[PDB]
Amino acid sequence: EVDDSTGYLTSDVGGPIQDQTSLKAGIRGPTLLEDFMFRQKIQHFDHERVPERAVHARGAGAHGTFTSYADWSNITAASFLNATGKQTPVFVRFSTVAGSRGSADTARDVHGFATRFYTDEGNFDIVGNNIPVFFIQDAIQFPDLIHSVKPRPDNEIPQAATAHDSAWDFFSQQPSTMHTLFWAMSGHGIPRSYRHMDGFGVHTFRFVKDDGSSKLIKWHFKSRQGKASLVWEEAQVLSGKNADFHRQDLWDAIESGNGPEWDVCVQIVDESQAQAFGFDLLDPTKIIPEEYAPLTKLGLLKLDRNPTNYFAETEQVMFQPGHIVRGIDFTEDPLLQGRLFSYLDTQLNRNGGPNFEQLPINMPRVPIHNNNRDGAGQMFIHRNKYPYTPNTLNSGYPRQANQNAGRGFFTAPGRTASGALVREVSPTFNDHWSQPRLFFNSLTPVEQQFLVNAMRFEISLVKSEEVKKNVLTQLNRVSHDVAVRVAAAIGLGAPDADDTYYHNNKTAGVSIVGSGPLPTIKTLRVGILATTSESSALDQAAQLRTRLEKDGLVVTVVAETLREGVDQTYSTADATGFDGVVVVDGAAALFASSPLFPTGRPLQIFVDAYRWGKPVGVCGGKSSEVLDAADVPEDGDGVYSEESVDMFVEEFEKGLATFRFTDRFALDS
Amino acid sequence: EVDDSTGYLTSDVGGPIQDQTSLKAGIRGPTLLEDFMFRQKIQHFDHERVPERAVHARGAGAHGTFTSYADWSNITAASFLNATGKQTPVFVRFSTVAGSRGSADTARDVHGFATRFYTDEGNFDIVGNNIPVFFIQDAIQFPDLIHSVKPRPDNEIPQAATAHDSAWDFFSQQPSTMHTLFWAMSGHGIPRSYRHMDGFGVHTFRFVKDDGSSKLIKWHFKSRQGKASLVWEEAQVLSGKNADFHRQDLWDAIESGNGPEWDVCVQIVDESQAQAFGFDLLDPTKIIPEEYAPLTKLGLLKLDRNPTNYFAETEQVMFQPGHIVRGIDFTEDPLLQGRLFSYLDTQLNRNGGPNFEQLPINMPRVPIHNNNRDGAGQMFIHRNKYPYTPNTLNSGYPRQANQNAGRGFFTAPGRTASGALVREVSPTFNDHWSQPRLFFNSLTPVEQQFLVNAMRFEISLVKSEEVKKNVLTQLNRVSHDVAVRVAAAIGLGAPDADDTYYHNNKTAGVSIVGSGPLPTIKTLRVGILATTSESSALDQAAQLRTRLEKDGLVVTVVAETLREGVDQTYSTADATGFDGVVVVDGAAALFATASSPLFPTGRPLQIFVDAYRWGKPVGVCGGKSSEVLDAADVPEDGDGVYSEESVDMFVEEFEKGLATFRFTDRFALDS
Amino acid sequence: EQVMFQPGHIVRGIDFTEDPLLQGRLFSYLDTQLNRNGGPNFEQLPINMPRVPIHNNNRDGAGQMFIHRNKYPYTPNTLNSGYPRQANQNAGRGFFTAPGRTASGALVREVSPTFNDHWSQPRLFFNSLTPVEQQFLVNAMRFEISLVKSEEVKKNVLTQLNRVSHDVAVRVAAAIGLGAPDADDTYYHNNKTAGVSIVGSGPLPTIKTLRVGILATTSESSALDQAAQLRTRLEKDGLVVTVVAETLREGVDQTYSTADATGFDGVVVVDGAAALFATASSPLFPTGRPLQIFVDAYRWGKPVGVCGGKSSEVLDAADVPEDGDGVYSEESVDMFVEEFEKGLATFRFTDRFALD
Ligand code: HDD
Ligand code: HDD
Ligand SMILES: *[C@@H]1O[C@H](CO)[C@@H](O[C@@H]2O[C@H](CO)[C@@H](O)[C@H](O)[C@H]2NC(C)=O)[C@H](O)[C@H]1NC(C)=O
Ligand SMILES: *[C@@H]1O[C@H](CO)[C@@H](O[C@@H]2O[C@H](CO)[C@@H](O)[C@H](O)[C@H]2NC(C)=O)[C@H](O)[C@H]1NC(C)=O
Ligand SMILES: *[C@@H]1O[C@H](CO)[C@@H](O[C@@H]2O[C@H](CO)[C@@H](O)[C@H](O)[C@H]2NC(C)=O)[C@H](O)[C@H]1NC(C)=O
Ligand SMILES: *[C@@H]1O[C@H](CO)[C@@H](O[C@@H]2O[C@H](CO)[C@@H](O)[C@H](O)[C@H]2NC(C)=O)[C@H](O)[C@H]1NC(C)=O
Ligand SMILES: *[C@@H]1O[C@H](CO)[C@@H](O[C@@H]2O[C@H](CO)[C@@H](O)[C@H](O)[C@H]2NC(C)=O)[C@H](O)[C@H]1NC(C)=O
Ligand SMILES: *[C@@H]1O[C@H](CO)[C@@H](O)[C@H](O)[C@H]1NC(C)=O
Ligand SMILES: [Ca+2]
């Protein structure tokens, strides 16, 4: 870390200098080439940018730690997992997928959840998503997926969105994508925060024990903050009002001592069970339903420290699935296999040089011993002048590490191969439709409506008639009902039911809206709509504040202008900034124009909050009546009307836990 | 151009190949290192991105042409300007300033307007903004301005916005910024499209004649589509609903044969007049008011062709003020001076190598003769095997070009220097406040309110009390009234009036809302809110369509679901998508506690009410039209509100509202 | 400088094998061009471009020189009618892996036992060289091993050499003053193979472009006339001729100052220059240079000769044996060339090199 809280400005080589005026040939003359102060400064500036990540360009990171719950030697040789209470430092970066680095956090997308464990046996990365399955079955297809999903190559439109022809052309032609597509079209596409989503490794990996035996595994990072998601119409506004929402949220949660947590869990099954669940475990488009393999809690992951310099830490972190440790191994998942190549190659693009692992954020916490040399930006000075193997002149050091010496990584010895070299897809990968259906069946009826609505939204933006038809064809193979309801919005006849893959199986744990109340409401945001006219209004506010802040909530008092007790103005305020909204009684005048905010804003905030399914309430005497003026039903679920401050809070806090009031949304017929 | 409409897939060296399945050791086996089809394709993918521009990362471009109105030999030796009707190909890129790639078009920012003329005497670049003055007086300060304005370096927040502590800390400590700050806080910060804004060179340059004499100049690109801007509350929504608004607009205008146009104009003054206007002309924080130097129309710029590949053309274009031609020269503007270094250096970052001028979009349209050799990505094979001067072995070729031979570029010979080498600011640069005031005085009273409101918005998001006070201090030096009104929103006492720079001077042409109606309404967007219940509703729509489309407008018919005659659904619709909004009579049911599973609650009315509140021409067309408005709470008699039965008379009335564009009577003023 | 080769640059008709060296190469040559070119579009350099059209979905990258018309660069698409099409064995003449190729067993980081004989083939190679060639090889090894500072390393080198040939180990060990270890005959044998010998591959099939230096002088007017006549003959047979003298002038290509034996395949002294080869010095070239060139040429095994009357005697002064193989003594210009040209074809006269 470099401290600049005191001292005189120096060049990068420590020579004291100024940087405020150019060296000129006369007070009104031209600038001089010999002005080294100018050029060193501007050169640095001109070269500040690096290429954004090819995918997941928009994201944010935090430091934390992982704690093991046990000695897991019975399932894996992995050292960071070899003792109860063992702590390993971590760094995590969350992201969206499609958008470039300045795009909104709250676009509809799949989300990245990438974790580095700086273990005492090397860095170990789990590079996953908030959705357990992926669009495609072979890495070689990744540029096709990503080209079709990103903006059109002629005009670069649209940013951060699947709502255009190419995306759906691809989805409709590459049916493997149905499963992920359904997830992304659910609320999983628009989480309330990084903290309210899970992480998944997606691929099956292997645990490997010192004796050489292997089990097949799936990583799950379960959120201890519960699952929550925005509603579309809300997300769209939020993208404009606050592109930085998710990163703001994570930053704040950590500043206030509410670091988010996850249980790091696995599903463990046998090599013999590769095809025992009615799909191939090498297929990254499938889940093992919890019904057939329960989760084992391995340890706790917690984030509790923000970075100091975003660029130096978050922007420069370079994850790789290739960062593997003794005790884990890969599987023959053709998607995973390709990823191994990509992540090592791409860092050359980003770093401009081969020494990227020497950046502080990428360095390990243990010594490095190898014969890698030179390259641009070489930061070490190697003492071993015989960097070859085998050597005698350095006494055969460094020594080869493997299964039986030096705790080397080793491939699971059980793994075997047979048959011809082929560029052909396994027939076992052919069912693209059942699991999407399983997924859809497992959502609450409102969740289903939302998903249909998300699909109606996007497909209606697809200009091409032929593509729309091909979309309906694919959707229909998952559910006729879905096809029918989606088709209705774009004015086409859904094709005739095809029941090859229809079924009524459900799975637990994939639903957001059906996952019951939040286990905590700490850090949720409450907006209090007040006024500077009635002296009573601000007193009501102040009292609500003390009560609510006591329960870990984040409170904002809104008024026409700022002053003691007021956090922000009606001008800068919006419903998307709050998880629940409270009008204090004394502000009724405002809800029934001003040069200090746009017309109708105070009521707009409240009405929006209500329509998006948020806990809304009026606190005070004439509360009975402020609602009929607002057109909000007094008896309605999650609408709160009370005089007793202590009782209002108590009631409201139950609404914040329910989080979304789903009775306010129309269903199909 | 590379065609891929037919054929089999090939590697980059032309070997026919496949790219859909990896090569595996057995059908359920691991992928093989020897799979070159895989690796070549993924390597390419892994290396697609290049660093975004250090500033102006978010932008869009188009191809067009420039036509000269005359032989301008009397003022400049510049060849692209030497004949009536002379045609030079151009490429233009517009942009914001602070946002990264992917940030919304409709953030509040200064805007870039960068023009390449591919002249028959070399490439000539005018790299300017939609605002005629800049924040700072010395290029060496650029990183300070930019650091403070971009996201905070600890958490990278907020994207594309000056609404945070550091920016205002900077503005308040660096008063030179007041002028540009006022412009950015006006509607100039949020133009309706790239087409509805002007371009300015900002700096004073020199025109130079073959005899060696020079005049001082200022470039102005005046928009033939007129000036128009969004209102804040609308821009915020738009940023979410359509980050791509400006680029979609420009793309569309060009596809439909409505290429935007600008008059390329200059102010021309004498070297003797450097300090004759009460400010130094080397100061990029000042304008020459039109009152003291009228504009001369030099020629016409028109954009009429979209690029084929965005990355290859728009992303790769690399502008440079250093791209100068015979007939123009620089001035000692310490901001311009530094720019010269930066734009050449930064392309190394962006291109990763020194041969960036060899990219098709950066190539000139004339031959190249010099001794530059090698470098990564060298695309030429040079025949001259004696690339030094002086040589005899290539008969002294290429020959030196200068004033008197080969039509060489040459520095204005009049230019002189004297005094000491100094890192000192000229005292003539010291008035940071008069011109901002001049600018403010020149805006309509509503425009002034909007500007106060923009400042109220931002300053209220500045967390630090001290910084807020210093902002008020600076604002006060421009106008006590402004300070008072702004201070009111953040609950502080404006400091006591300081009249050193107060005055009542006005200047013409800087006002948007006061620039009268638009000269054309072609390409403006009209949304027609209909329904699929009443068969009458869609028929009303269809008839409005034929009538409105005939006048060059872009028409969207909105209903619950899609079908013949319906362009989009209520679900995907929003007021920000339209310049005016029309409800057809037969849809009254939808605007009256009714809900649908096909769109969010209250959407149809929300669109209309939004349109009205943002100052747009709104109307109901049909019989019961009188009554649909009272339900909507929109005043029937109000300016730009339209109520008629006669389709022909409705259009005629509505089209007048579109030209007025914004109805300013709906916005509250201070007291 | 910019040409960038790749074994991955393969065509329909050829395929790789499971050679663990070849396999790795495939990765390395694609990766390294990123280093050299600084960017992913190296195949767009003129020298690396193919002569046929390119159809694929690769896009962007720094230094992108194309402007692609296909705005749907993904597969599968319908929006560009499923183009470009997949090419394979049965369509579009696609590359394809040999279908016979199969795999079996475990994933292993182990060396095949079939790779374990490191010594027979070197021996085969050595046995197939002429005895002088063998001496030269021993001598190269003597040269290098004696520059190896470490005693232990020298011993380990002898160990390995010995396993190929005890003779070789003994001869090499002689120069570095160590005892070769005891014969180990596991891989010894007397098999020979054809075509791996240079010195034993008989005369050259052509002598066109070989370089002949003619050592003359500007004192005797006769010397330059002899030269000029040798030139016309020799140049007629496609040789490249350099006439060397003290200074330049018409008919002289280079000076003794800039001249050296390494610059010539054979060397001829014209009779009229005898004075130069006999304690005589000049400020125009270093002491002894003219003779040094000749003596060097002879000692390196090159065809050397004197052309003229007093040719019999210039050699005894030079200490070059008149009767020696590839030494040429004649008065008749036509018969000198004819004899010399045979020496040029033999190229190296191996009888001048001592054996063990
Ligand atoms: C072979 C191509 C390829 C394929 C099939 C995938 N990825 Fe990837 N991924 C990349 C190639 C890639 C990359 C282009 O190499 C990136 C971009 C920046 C980087 O360092 O790696 C990357 C970025 C990246 C990031 C951002 C890391 C960060 O925050 O810096 C995450 C979280 C993932 N990926 C996760 C996945 C998951 C869960 C996949 C499905 C199993 C997946 N990727 C398939
Ligand atoms: C000393 C540094 C410096 C200063 C004082 C300025 N600029 Fe700049 N500008 C750059 C350094 C720079 C740059 C970093 O070199 C850029 C970024 C990307 C590029 O190629 O050049 C650039 C980009 C850039 C672009 C984008 C062109 C495109 O679309 O590719 C425009 C329109 C401008 N500038 C205009 C201006 C104006 C009107 C200025 C005030 C008079 C100005 N710049 C001051
Ligand atoms: C591997 O060892 C761990 C270490 O205790 C086992 O975890 C415990 O399992 C028993 C049930 O078998 C429970 O009563 C404990 O509460 C578990 N503790 C924890 C922290 O999980 C684990 O079961 C063993 N697994 C196998 C496959 O042998
Ligand atoms: C858990 O973690 C580390 C894995 O390296 C182990 O501690 C190491 O143990 C070996 C002894 O075999 C030492 O040579 C290393 O130097 C130790 N390293 C550190 C960092 O302490 C430990 O053995 C493992 N525990 C179990 C129960 O397997
Ligand atoms: C729906 O659920 C049933 C019940 O588990 C599944 O049928 C079983 O599948 C497993 C795995 O293939 C088999 O071992 C059993 O023989 C089946 N059991 C019974 C009781 O029928 C079925 O596979 C599921 N279908 C889908 C499409 O998910
Ligand atoms: C430079 O020459 C041009 C060439 O015509 C002059 O422009 C015209 O000026 C005349 C006479 O005042 C006007 O009637 C026209 O409006 C101009 N024509 C066009 C097409 O612009 C210009 O005035 C000359 N300027 C100077 C300083 O000599
Ligand atoms: C306008 O500019 C063009 C470009 O310089 C001039 O045409 C050139 O004239 C020179 C002679 O001075 C010729 O050698 C070139 O062949 C011409 N260039 C081209 C591209 O054709 C033209 O003469 C200029 N007109 C005036 C009035 O100066
Ligand atoms: C204001 O305008 C008048 C007339 O243009 C001019 O004389 C005066 O100097 C101006 N003063 C300032 C401060 O702009
Ligand atoms: Ca580079």
Q: Tell me the three-class secondary structure of A511-548, residue by residue.
A: CCCCCCCCCCCCCCEEEEECCCCCHHHHHHHHHHHHHH
Give the separation between CA B628 and CA B611, rounded to whole angstroms.
15
The answer on C337 and C228 residing in a single domain is yes
| Tokens representing residue A140 in the block | 């070689």
Count, in order, helices (H) and strands (E) of chain B: 17, 18
Q: Which residue on chain A is closest to C17 by alpha carbon?
A: A421
Which CATH number do you get for residue C234? 3.40.50.880
Give the separation between CA B39 and CA C7, rounded to whole angstroms.
13
Write A562-568 long-range contacts (CB < 8 A, 24+). A562/B460, A562/B489, A562/B490, A562/B491, A563/A532, A563/B491, A564/B491, A565/A538, A565/A541, A566/A530, A566/A532, A566/A538, A566/B491, A568/B460, A568/B461
Q: What is the DSSP letter of C244?
A: E
Residue in A173, A354, A421 nearest the CB of C103: A421
Closest by CA to C73, choosing from A143, A27, B357, is: A143
Neighbours of chain A (3+ CB pairs under 8 A): B, C
Give the end of a domain, one of B421, B446, B461. Answer: B421
| Tokens representing residue C43 in the block | 């195949």
Our mutation pick for probing the ligand 4 site, out of A75, A82, A209, A210, counting the most ligand atoms within 8 A of Cβ, is A82
**Residues of B labelled catalytic:** 56, 129
With CB atoms and an 8 Å threshold, state whether C95 touches B47. Answer: no
Our mutation pick for probing the ligand 7 site, out of B72, B76, B82, counting the most ligand atoms within 8 A of Cβ, is B82
List beta partners, residue B656.
none
The vertex-A362 CA angle with A356 and A367, nearest 5°, equals 100
Residue in A18, A146, A456 nearest the CB of B423: A18
Whether ligand 7 lies within 6 angstroms of the CB of B210 is answered as no
Residue in A144, A154, A420 nearest the CB of C101: A420
Strand order in the sheet with B568-569: B568-569, B554-559, B525-529, B580-584, B618-621, B641-644
Identify the burial level of B154 via C-beta atoms within 10 angstroms of its C-beta, where 0-12 means exposed, 13-18 middle and 19 or more buried.
Answer: middle
Contacting residues for B169 by C-beta, under 8 A, at least 6 apart: B148, B464, B467, B470
DSSP B243-283: TTHHHHHHHHHHHTT---EEEEEEEEEEGGGGGTTSS-TT-
| Tokens representing residue B171 in the block | 């503005």
Judged by a CB distance cut-off of 8 A, whether residue C40 touches chain A is: yes
| C interface test, pick of A49, A138, A141, A144 with most C CB neighbours within 10 Å | A144
With CB atoms and an 8 Å threshold, state whether B352 touches C63. Answer: yes
- Chain C residues within an 8 Å CB radius of B27: none
Cα–Cα distances (Å) from B255 to B51, B93, B304, B619, in that order, read 30, 17, 8, 29
Residue in C74, C101, C102 nearest the CB of A166: C74
The answer on C339 and C219 residing in a single domain is yes
Q: Which amino acid is at B259?
A: G
Resolution expressed in Å? 2.7
Write A647-653 long-range contacts (CB < 8 A, 24+). A648/A544, A648/A582, A648/A617, A648/A619, A649/A544, A649/A547, A649/A548, A649/A551, A651/A617, A652/A526, A652/A580, A652/A582, A652/A615, A652/A617, A653/A521, A653/A551
H or E segment and range at residue B421: strand B421-422
With CB atoms and an 8 Å threshold, state whether B156 touches A42. Answer: no
Q: Which residue on chain C is closest to A419 by alpha carbon?
A: C102
Strands B112-119, B87-95: pairing is antiparallel
Contacting residues for B444 by C-beta, under 8 A, at least 6 apart: B511, B513, B514, B664
Judged by a CB distance cut-off of 8 A, whether residue B362 touches chain C is: no
Give the separation between CA A268 and CA A294, rounded to whole angstroms.
8
Domain total of chain A: 3
* CB distance A423 to A417 below 8 Å: no
* Neighbour count for residue A139 (Cβ, 10 Å): 23
* CB distance B625 to B588 below 8 Å: no
Judged by a CB distance cut-off of 8 A, whether residue A376 touches chain B is: no
**Which is it for the CA torsion B311, B313, B318, B319, positive or negative?**
negative
Nearest protein Cα to ligand 7, atom 3: B79
Give the separation between CA C186 and CA C180, rounded to whole angstroms.
17
Query: Chains A, B: CB contacts under 8 A, how many?
Result: 406
Cα–Cα distances (Å) from C350 to C197, C302, C319, in that order, read 14, 9, 18
Indicate the SS3 state at residue A422.
strand
Instruction: Report chain A's terminal Cα–Cα distance, integer Å.
Output: 62
H or E segment and range at residue C214: strand C211-215
* CB distance B306 to B62 below 8 Å: yes
| Tokens representing residue B210 in the block | 């073959």
Q: Which amino acid is at A464?
A: S
Contacting residues for B501 by C-beta, under 8 A, at least 6 apart: B431, B433, B434, B437, B477, B478
* CB distance B379 to C46 below 8 Å: yes
**CA B286 to ligand 6 centroid distance, Å:** 27
Which CATH number do you get for residue A412? 2.40.180.10
* CB distance C306 to C329 below 8 Å: yes
The answer on B657 and B585 residing in a single domain is yes
Please give all residues whose beta carbon lies within 6 A of any atom in ligand 2, as ranges: A 42, 46; B 53-56, 59, 93, 95, 112, 114, 127-129, 134, 139, 142, 202-203, 284, 317-319, 335, 338-339, 342-343, 346
The vertex-B358 CA angle with B357 and B359, nearest 5°, equals 95
Cα–Cα distances (Å) from B649 to A582, B544, B643, B644, C56, in that order, read 47, 11, 10, 7, 55
* CB distance B191 to B113 below 8 Å: no
Gap positions in chain B, given as the residue before each gap (C–N > 2.5 A)?
592
Place of tokens 């190909």: B89
The answer on B557 and B488 residing in a single domain is no
3-state DSSP percent of chain A in helix, strand and coil, to 5: 30, 20, 50
Which residues 99-118 of C are in CB contact (within 8 Å) with B? 103, 107
The answer on A342 and A385 residing in a single domain is yes
* CB distance A604 to A577 below 8 Å: no
- What is the CB-side half-sphere exposure of residue C158 using CA atoms within 13 A? 25
The answer on C124 and C247 residing in a single domain is no
* CB distance A109 to A240 below 8 Å: no
Identify the burial level of A657 via C-beta atoms within 10 angstroms of its C-beta, where 0-12 means exposed, 13-18 middle and 19 or more buried.
Answer: middle
* CB distance B149 to B134 below 8 Å: no
Give the separation between CA B623 and CA B646, rounded to whole angstroms.
9
Nearest protein Cα to ligand 7, atom 25: B82
Q: Which amino acid is at B273?
A: Q
Judged by a CB distance cut-off of 8 A, whether residue B27 touches chain C is: no
Whether ligand 8 lies within 6 angstroms of the CB of B503 is answered as yes
Whether ligand 7 lies within 6 angstroms of the CB of B88 is answered as no
Cα–Cα distances (Å) from B62 to A509, B91, B120, B265, in that order, read 50, 6, 20, 20
Closest by CA to C2, choosing from B380, B359, A374, B36, is: B380
Cα distance from A423 to chain C (closest Cα, Å)? 9
Our mutation pick for probing the ligand 8 site, out of B291, B505, B506, B507, counting the most ligand atoms within 8 A of Cβ, is B505
Count, in order, helices (H) and strands (E) of chain A: 17, 18
Place of tokens 């065609």: B3
**Domain ranges, residue C297:** 207-356
Conformational region of residue A328, where left means phi above 0, alpha means psi within -120 to 50, and beta covers everything else: beta
Give the separation between CA A105 and CA A244, rounded to whole angstroms.
6
Please provide residue A87's backbone torsions phi and psi, each rounded to the nearest 5 degrees.
-100, 130
Nearest ligand by distance to the CA of A43: 2
**CA C21 to ligand 3 centroid distance, Å:** 47
Judged by a CB distance cut-off of 8 A, whether residue C194 touches chain B is: no
Nearest protein Cα to ligand 3, atom 8: A70
Cα–Cα distances (Å) from B167 to B145, B151, B467, in that order, read 8, 9, 10
The answer on C322 and C218 residing in a single domain is yes
Give the separation between CA A496 and CA A472, rounded to whole angstroms.
11
Q: What is the DSSP letter of B609?
A: H
Taking each helix axis as running N to C, give the angle between helix A601-611 and helix A623-630, from 0 to 180 degrees, rounded to the nearest 10.
90
Which residues 43-102 of C are in CB contact (within 8 Å) with B? 43-46, 48-71, 73, 75, 80-81, 83-88, 91-95, 97
- Chain C residues within an 8 Å CB radius of A337: none
The answer on A430 and A358 residing in a single domain is no
* CB distance A180 to A134 below 8 Å: yes
Q: What is the DSSP letter of C235?
A: H
List beta partners, residue B126.
B115
Give the separation between CA C154 and CA C145, rounded to whole angstroms.
7
Give the separation between CA A517 and CA A520, rounded to whole angstroms.
9
Q: Which amino acid is at A663?
A: D
Give the separation between CA B26 and CA A383, rounded to whole angstroms.
45
Give the separation between CA B264 and CA B278, rounded to whole angstroms.
26
The answer on C184 and C137 residing in a single domain is yes
- Chain A residues within an 8 Å CB radius of B237: 237, 240
Place of tokens 């374990």: C116
Q: Which residue on chain C is closest to A349 by alpha carbon?
A: C39
Contacting residues for A648 by C-beta, under 8 A, at least 6 apart: A544, A582, A617, A619, A640, A642
What value does the CA radius of gyration of chain B take, rounded to a whole number of Å?
A: 28
Which CATH number do you get for residue C133? 1.20.1370.20
Burial B658-671 (b: 16+ CB within 10 A, else e): bbebbbbebbeeee
Identify the burial level of B618 via C-beta atoms within 10 angstroms of its C-beta, where 0-12 means exposed, 13-18 middle and 19 or more buried.
Answer: buried
The answer on A298 and A240 residing in a single domain is yes
* CB distance B625 to B644 below 8 Å: yes
* CB distance A18 to A37 below 8 Å: yes
Q: Which residue on chain A is closest to C33 by alpha carbon?
A: A348
**Which is it for the CA torsion A36, A37, A38, A43, positive or negative?**
positive
Contacting residues for B230 by C-beta, under 8 A, at least 6 apart: B106, B187, B190, B191, B192, B238
* CB distance B245 to B190 below 8 Å: no
With CB atoms and an 8 Å threshold, state whether B43 touches A461. Answer: no
Q: Which residue on chain A is closest to B280 by alpha carbon?
A: A28
* CB distance B403 to B212 below 8 Å: yes
Whether ligand 8 lies within 6 angstroms of the CB of B572 is answered as no
Closest by CA to A337, choosing from A268, A412, A283, is: A283
* CB distance A328 to A78 below 8 Å: yes
The answer on A444 and A331 residing in a single domain is no
Give the end of a domain, one of A421, A450, A485. Answer: A421
Give the end of a domain, one of A383, A406, A421. Answer: A421
Please provide residue B104's backbone torsions phi and psi, each rounded to the nearest 5 degrees.
-75, 145
Give the separation between CA B163 and CA B540, rounded to whole angstroms.
45
Please provide residue B377's backbone torsions phi and psi, each rounded to the nearest 5 degrees.
65, 30
Whether ligand 7 lies within 6 angstroms of the CB of B119 is answered as no
The answer on A166 and A52 residing in a single domain is yes
Our mutation pick for probing the ligand 5 site, out of A287, A501, A503, A510, counting the most ligand atoms within 8 A of Cβ, is A503
